């Protein structure tokens, strides 16, 4: 008898990407997508010009 402790995934796949730009001063991006955990998201400061 062996018990099923944490498993690992090494082959992943990505789809339906999302960016959600925001002005230099209006807070920072929300992206309702991020709401779900099935999506992985990271928040980055990007240049925004004229």
């Amino acid at each position, epitope marked *: 008898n062996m018990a099923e402790v944490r498993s690992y995934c090494y082959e992943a796949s990505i789809s*339906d990407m*999302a*960016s*959600d*730009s*925001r*002005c230099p001063t209006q807070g920072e991006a929300y*992206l*309702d997508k991020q709401s779900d955990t099935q999506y992985v998201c990271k928040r980055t400061l990007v240049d*925004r010009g004229w």
Partner: antibody
Amino acid sequence: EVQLVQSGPDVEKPGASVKVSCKASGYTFTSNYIHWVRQAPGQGLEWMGVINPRGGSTASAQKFQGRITMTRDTSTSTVYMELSSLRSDDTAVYYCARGGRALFYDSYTTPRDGGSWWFDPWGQGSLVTVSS
Amino acid sequence: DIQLTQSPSSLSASVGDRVTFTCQASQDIRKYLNWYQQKPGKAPKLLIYDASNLKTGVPSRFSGSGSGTDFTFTISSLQPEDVATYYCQQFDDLPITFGQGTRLQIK
């Protein structure tokens, strides 16, 4: 030719979720903010929300916070609207429209607008009825 | 959040008349106002962007004006294709609202 098209009219259960499609034609799909606006049969128009075809950015009004979801589909150049937990007021017609200088991912209204602000492809209107 | 009254509620006039609609909002909407007319069962009609600008393809039969908070649309000469409900709506601050309507009728 720049033009939007909705799905057919639909009838759903109270408390269900309805998804209406909006397909674009005649323009680069990643250059026009898609605005969704409701209209009850006897009522006027009230803006529901906005999505950007690029990056799937989203926003709406508090009249739909927690029920409305808006997603992109870059392949066929489509946008999909889900209303969740349907309610007796939802029996209406919903409109999708292309809008302005969709540069990155937002509403972006402090800069300019107009020139069919969102009014070239108002499509045909999606009639939805919510009952049993 | 951007209460906008659109007066009158309805009107009816003969062909070849000028008609004007007013909309005043409780807020400052400097130039972010737009105008449509829609039939029942229609996509609305190209009327006005920026409350002062005619769109390509729109007949010069229509005009729009107004600066600060209240704005006037005008049909120069009434025609049978002018039966619709006319709407004015702002663009700013993003609880976007419209007017309830201004309805027409030919005599």
